[PDB]
Amino acid sequence: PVEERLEYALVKGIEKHIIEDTEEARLNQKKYPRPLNIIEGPLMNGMKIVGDLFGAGKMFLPQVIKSARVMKKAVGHLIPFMEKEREETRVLNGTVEEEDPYQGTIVLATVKGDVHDIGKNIVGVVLGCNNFRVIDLGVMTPCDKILKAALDHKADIIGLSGLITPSLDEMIFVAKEMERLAIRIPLLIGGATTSKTHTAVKIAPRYSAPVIHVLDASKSVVVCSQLLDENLKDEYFEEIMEEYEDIRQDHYESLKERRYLPLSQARKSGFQMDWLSEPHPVKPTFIGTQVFEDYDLQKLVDYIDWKPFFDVWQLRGKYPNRGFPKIFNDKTVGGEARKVYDDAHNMLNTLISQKKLRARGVVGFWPAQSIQDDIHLYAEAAVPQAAEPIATFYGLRQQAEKDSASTEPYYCLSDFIAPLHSGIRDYLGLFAVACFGVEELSKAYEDDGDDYSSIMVKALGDRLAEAFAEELHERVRRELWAYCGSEQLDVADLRRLRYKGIRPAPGYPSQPDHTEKLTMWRLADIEQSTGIRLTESLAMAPASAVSGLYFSNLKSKYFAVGKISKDQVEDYALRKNISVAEVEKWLGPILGYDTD
């Protein structure tokens, strides 16, 4: 029989004879009077088997993508006959019937200002494997375009993705706009920057229709099936409503229960250094920017941290095999991890040897001094105490009250730079790297129909950007700044943060203000030197880009600012010479007080 062959090819992921079997079944008009039967019947049966096996955890994500590719080739062979049948019937009967076999239509988009779509692509493929008609809209999607896509495609669900905290404001804007046209379509929320608490507190109240946060792609199928089943729709919505009300009440009680120090008191208990006895800062080999136009990708292959790459494919090894290279020894996901790693190495070799990917970056150093909570940068030949700063990076100090038994100070990034009045020269660095050509390769793979290769190339581009950042930080410590000239740590120690100094990035918990990237881009001329541009929400395009600041102090360390009070917001607005509303917008996730 041909149905068994179709199901076996779908489940196992064999495109070798899928065209032949599909054509053979199509020619068997006895079983299938219309080609819709080959879709509604044997083909979606294998897709459903794959989807439920993935939901149960027996089959892993890469095999799901293989099955999706096989199904895509099958439907691609079938769609000319679908078009022929529809064109014939439009003239024979004058009408087009409801021939939809999918469970529902879902508009899937990444909100404006965000350029990350690996998770959105994975979610779309997973949903498509469960007979959902996924409508992927891309990145930096305007809200009006999402609403128009939902209206034109008679969509049933809308999904929003976002990776940076400025995307949360866009998501809330989309929710309230959906409310403004009185749309009743359920709205799912996903992304690395999203959380269950933020959705119920901020996103959920703005929309009357269901708004559900989804942690991963596996839960997305369950949520969509429950939302599209009328026997479970209202009860699931009510349960979501009660749990979100409970979490909102708990959130407000907590917010009443937190204590914060006064800003002056927090400053008085900040981190201190003995600059009169600590070793003096090491002057960099140059003051200004050194631009890299075409970095050696082969040097970046051995600097790649593969654990986030295996986290992309959801191949999470159990203890003690939870990380590379021990993941290959795991009983369950060892074979799939090995297959994915081999494919990644093959594609990396092909792209590097063909010059299909280019890495560009810039690193700069300037004299820097500290004035309370700010780091001021000066010219090369200018005396810091008698010259105007050419740039300033404003820091945020931890304000949340700590445990009485705790003795840790209240950290700020300016604590790692020598104060101006101390009479000690100090310097600060910054960098920005990227991997160029991932977008075109992903588009080419998606046009062919290989979503697996597109996801692989996106993950490899991100890995290459991270490896470039790590290697450049290694060079800065030993060669360009030479404050750690005796460093000889291996890449394993590099991934363990065992070296001197730190490289905080804007938007991270050390300094969660994304507007710090504008100063770097204006100072180091990053967009003109390397081609990396900031979007409207201060995200780096291409998405395979990493930036940050270089702190060479021995005592410097990574810290989380946490929640801050109103007074720190007012002081930050006064220092930055911007309105309080802008500070609250760019520091919304770290506000310890309500704003509405």
Ligand code: B12
């Ligand atoms: C490696 C990594 C990167 C990658 C991002 C990977 C990518 N492009 O997908 C890169 C190298 C680009 C990077 C850069 C930066 N990152 Co980053 N990064 C990480 C990290 C460690 C991995 C998370 C991740 O992306 N996994 C990959 C995908 C598969 O996971 P996911 O997006 O969560 O997708 C899943 C689910 O969320 C869900 N899902 C996703 N979308 C949708 C949509 C719908 C509808 C549904 C139903 C489900 C759904 O399904 C997916 C499958 O599981 C996280 C830490 C963390 N724990 O989240 C930080 C994190 C996401 N990074 C963040 C930040 C700070 C940045 C930067 C701004 C820092 C910088 N260099 O300036 C830049 C971004 C600018 C840029 N580069 O263009 C923040 C978030 C923003 C913030 N705090 O303001 C995080 C959370 C770190 C942090 N603690 O602050 N980073």
